CSV table of N, CA and C in Angstrom, one decimal:
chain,number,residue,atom,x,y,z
A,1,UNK,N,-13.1,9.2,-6.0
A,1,UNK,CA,-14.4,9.7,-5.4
A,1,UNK,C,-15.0,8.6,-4.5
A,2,UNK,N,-15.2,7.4,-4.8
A,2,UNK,CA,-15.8,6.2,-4.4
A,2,UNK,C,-14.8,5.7,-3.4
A,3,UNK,N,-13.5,5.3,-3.5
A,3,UNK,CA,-12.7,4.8,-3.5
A,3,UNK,C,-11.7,5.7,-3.0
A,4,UNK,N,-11.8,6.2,-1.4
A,4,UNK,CA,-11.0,7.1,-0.6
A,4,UNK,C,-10.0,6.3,0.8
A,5,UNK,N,-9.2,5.8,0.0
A,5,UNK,CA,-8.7,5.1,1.3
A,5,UNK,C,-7.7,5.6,1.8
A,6,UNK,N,-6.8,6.6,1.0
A,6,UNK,CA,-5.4,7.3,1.4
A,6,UNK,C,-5.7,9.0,0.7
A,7,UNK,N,-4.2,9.4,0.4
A,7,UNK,CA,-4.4,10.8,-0.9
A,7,UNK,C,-5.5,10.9,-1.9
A,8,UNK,N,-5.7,9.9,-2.0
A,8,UNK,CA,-6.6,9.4,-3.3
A,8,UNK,C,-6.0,9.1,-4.4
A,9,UNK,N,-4.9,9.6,-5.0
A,9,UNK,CA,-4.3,9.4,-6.0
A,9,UNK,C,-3.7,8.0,-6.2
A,10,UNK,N,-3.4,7.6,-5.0
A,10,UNK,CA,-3.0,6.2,-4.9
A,10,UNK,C,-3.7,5.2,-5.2
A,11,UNK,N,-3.5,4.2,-6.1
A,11,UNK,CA,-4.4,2.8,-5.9
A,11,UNK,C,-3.8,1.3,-6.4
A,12,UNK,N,-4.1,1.0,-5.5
A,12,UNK,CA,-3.6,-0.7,-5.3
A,12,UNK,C,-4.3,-1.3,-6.2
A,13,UNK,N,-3.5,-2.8,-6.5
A,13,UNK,CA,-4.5,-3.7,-7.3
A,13,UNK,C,-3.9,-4.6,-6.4
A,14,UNK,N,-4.6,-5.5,-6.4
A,14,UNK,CA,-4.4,-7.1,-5.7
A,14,UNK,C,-3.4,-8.2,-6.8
A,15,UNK,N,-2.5,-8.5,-6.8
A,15,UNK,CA,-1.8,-9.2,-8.2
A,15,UNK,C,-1.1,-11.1,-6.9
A,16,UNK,N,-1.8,-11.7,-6.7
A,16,UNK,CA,-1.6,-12.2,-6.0
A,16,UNK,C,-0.9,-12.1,-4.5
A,17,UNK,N,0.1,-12.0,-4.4
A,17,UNK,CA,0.9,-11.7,-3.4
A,17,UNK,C,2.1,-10.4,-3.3
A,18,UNK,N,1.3,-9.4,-4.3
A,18,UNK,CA,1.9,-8.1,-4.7
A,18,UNK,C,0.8,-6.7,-4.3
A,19,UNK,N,0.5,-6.4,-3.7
A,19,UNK,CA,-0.8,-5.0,-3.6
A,19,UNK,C,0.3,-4.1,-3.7
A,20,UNK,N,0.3,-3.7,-5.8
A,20,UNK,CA,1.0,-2.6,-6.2
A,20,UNK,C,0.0,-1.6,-6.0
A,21,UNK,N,0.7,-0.4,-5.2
A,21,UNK,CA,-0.2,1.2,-5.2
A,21,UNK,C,0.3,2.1,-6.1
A,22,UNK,N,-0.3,2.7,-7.1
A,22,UNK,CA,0.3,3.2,-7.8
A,22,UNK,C,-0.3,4.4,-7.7
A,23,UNK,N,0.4,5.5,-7.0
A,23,UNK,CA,0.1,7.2,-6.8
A,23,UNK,C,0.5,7.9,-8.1
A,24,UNK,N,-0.2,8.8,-8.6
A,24,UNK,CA,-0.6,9.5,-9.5
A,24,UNK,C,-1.4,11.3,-9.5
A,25,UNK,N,-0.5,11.4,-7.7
A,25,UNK,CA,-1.1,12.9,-7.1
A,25,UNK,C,0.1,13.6,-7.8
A,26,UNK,N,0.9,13.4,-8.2
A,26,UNK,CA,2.3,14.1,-8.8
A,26,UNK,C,3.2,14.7,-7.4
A,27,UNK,N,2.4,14.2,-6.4
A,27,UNK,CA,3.5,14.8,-5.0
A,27,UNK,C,3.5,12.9,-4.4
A,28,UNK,N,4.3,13.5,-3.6
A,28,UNK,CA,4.9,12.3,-2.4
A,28,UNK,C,3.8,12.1,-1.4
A,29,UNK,N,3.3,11.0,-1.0
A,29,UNK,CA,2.2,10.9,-0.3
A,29,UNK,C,2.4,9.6,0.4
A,30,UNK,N,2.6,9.9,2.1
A,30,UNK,CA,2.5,8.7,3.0
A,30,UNK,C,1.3,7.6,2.9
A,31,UNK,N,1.8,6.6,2.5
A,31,UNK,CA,0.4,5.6,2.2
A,31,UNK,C,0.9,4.6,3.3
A,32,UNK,N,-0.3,3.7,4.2
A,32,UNK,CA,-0.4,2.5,4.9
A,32,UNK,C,-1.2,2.0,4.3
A,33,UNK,N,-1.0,0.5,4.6
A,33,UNK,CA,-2.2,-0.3,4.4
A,33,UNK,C,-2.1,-1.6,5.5
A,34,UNK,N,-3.7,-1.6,5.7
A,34,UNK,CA,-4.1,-2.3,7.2
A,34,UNK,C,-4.2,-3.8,6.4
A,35,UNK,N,-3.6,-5.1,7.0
A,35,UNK,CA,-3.5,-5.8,6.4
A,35,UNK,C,-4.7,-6.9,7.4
A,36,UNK,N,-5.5,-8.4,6.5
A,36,UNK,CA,-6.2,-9.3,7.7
A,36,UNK,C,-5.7,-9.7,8.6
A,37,UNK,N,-3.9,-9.4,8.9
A,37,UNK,CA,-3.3,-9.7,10.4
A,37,UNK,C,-2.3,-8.6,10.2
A,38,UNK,N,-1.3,-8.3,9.8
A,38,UNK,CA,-0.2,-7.7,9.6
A,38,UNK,C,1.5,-7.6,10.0
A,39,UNK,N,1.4,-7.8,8.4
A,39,UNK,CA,2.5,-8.5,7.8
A,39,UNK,C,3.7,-7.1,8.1
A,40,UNK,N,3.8,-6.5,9.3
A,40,UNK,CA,4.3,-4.9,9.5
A,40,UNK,C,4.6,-3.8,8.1
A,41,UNK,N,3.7,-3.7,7.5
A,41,UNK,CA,3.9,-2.9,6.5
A,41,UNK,C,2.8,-1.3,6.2
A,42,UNK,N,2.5,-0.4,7.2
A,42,UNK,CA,1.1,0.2,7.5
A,42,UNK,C,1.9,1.8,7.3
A,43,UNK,N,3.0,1.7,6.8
A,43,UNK,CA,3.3,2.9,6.5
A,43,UNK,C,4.7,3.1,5.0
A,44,UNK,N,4.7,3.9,4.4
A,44,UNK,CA,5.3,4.3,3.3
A,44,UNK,C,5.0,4.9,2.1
A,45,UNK,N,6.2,6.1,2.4
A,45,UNK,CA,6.0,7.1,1.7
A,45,UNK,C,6.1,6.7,-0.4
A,46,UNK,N,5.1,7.4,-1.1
A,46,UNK,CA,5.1,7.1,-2.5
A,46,UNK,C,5.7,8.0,-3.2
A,47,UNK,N,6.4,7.8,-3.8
A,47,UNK,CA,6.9,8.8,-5.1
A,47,UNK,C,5.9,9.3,-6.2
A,48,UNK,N,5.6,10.6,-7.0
A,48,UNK,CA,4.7,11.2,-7.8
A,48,UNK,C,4.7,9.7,-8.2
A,49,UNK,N,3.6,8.7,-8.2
A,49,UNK,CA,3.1,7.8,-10.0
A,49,UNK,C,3.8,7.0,-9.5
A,50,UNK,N,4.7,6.9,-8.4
A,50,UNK,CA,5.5,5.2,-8.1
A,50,UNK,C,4.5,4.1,-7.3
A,51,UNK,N,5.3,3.3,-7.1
A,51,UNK,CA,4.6,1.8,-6.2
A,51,UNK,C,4.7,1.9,-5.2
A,52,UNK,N,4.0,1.1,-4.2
A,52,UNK,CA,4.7,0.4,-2.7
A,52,UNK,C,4.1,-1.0,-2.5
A,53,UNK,N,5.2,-1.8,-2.7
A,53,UNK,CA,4.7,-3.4,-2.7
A,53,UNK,C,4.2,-3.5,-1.6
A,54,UNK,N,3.1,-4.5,-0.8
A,54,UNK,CA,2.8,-4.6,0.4
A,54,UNK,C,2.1,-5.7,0.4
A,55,UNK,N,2.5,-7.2,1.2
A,55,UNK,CA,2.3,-8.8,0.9
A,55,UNK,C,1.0,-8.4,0.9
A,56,UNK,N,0.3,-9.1,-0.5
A,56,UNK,CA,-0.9,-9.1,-0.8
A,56,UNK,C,-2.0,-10.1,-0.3
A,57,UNK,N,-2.8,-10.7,-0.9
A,57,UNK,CA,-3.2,-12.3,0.1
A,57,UNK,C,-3.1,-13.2,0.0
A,58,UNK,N,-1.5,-13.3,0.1
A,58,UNK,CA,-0.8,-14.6,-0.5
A,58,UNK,C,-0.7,-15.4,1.2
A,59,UNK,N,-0.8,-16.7,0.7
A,59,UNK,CA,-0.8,-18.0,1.6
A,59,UNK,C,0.4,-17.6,3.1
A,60,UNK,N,1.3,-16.9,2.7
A,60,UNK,CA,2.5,-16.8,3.2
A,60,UNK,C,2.5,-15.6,3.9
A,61,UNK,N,1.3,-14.7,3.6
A,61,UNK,CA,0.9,-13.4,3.9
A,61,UNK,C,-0.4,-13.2,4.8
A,62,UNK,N,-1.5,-12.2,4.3
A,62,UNK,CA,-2.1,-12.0,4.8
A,62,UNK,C,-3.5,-11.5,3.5
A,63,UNK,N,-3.4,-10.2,3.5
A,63,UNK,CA,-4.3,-9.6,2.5
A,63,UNK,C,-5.0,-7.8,3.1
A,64,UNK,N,-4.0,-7.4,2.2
A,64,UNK,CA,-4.1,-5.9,2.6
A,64,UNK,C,-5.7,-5.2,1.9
A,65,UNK,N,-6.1,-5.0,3.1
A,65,UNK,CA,-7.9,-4.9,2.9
A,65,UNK,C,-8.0,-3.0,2.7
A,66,UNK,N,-7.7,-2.4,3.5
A,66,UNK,CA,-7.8,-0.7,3.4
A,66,UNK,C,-6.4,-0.1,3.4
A,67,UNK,N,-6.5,0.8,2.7
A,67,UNK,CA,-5.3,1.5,2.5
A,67,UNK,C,-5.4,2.5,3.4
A,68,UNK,N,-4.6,3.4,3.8
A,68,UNK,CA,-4.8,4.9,5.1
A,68,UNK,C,-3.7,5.5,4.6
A,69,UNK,N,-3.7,6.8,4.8
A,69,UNK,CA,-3.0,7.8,4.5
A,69,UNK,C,-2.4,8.1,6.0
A,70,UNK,N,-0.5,7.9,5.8
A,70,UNK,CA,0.6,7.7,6.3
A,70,UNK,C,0.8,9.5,6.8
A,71,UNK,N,1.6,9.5,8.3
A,71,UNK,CA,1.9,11.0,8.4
A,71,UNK,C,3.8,10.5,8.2
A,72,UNK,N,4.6,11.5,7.4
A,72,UNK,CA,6.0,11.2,7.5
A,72,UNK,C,6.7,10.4,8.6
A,73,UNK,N,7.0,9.4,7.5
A,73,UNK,CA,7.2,8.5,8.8
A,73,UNK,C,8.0,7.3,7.7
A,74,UNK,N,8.8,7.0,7.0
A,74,UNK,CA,9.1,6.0,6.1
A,74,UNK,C,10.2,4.6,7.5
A,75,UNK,N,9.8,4.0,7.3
A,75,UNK,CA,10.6,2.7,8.0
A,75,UNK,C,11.9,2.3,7.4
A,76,UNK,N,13.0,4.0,8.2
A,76,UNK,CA,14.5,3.2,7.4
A,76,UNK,C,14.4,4.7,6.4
A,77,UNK,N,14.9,5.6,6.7
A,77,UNK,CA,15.0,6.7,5.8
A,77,UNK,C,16.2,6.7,5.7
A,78,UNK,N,17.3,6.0,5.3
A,78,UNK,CA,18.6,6.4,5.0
A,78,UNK,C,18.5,6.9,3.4
């Protein structure tokens, strides 16, 4: 409700240099996340309840601030 950055079902935690999203819509849902520079990672699709790792704000990274909701589009669908 508060906290609408993508499907909704999705939600990241910050785990140092890991921003696990963990969706929980029970469908497949394009998630981005806008990172403080970007580390090219602003689109991928989530499995019902799976992750999408995305460099968190680690030294080496950046720090993924808002999440956005992805249109079909995964980078590399083989």
């Amino acid at each position: 409700a508060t906290g609408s950055p993508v499907a909704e079902c999705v939600e990241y935690f910050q785990s140092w240099r890991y921003t696990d999203v963990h969706n929980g819509c029970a469908d497949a849902v394009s998630v981005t996340v806008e990172y403080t520079h970007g580390q090219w990672a602003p689109c991928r699709v989530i499995e019902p309840g799976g992750w999408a790792t995305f460099a968190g704000y680690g030294t080496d990274g950046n720090y993924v601030t808002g999440l956005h909701t992805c249109d079909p589009a995964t980078p590399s669908g083989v």
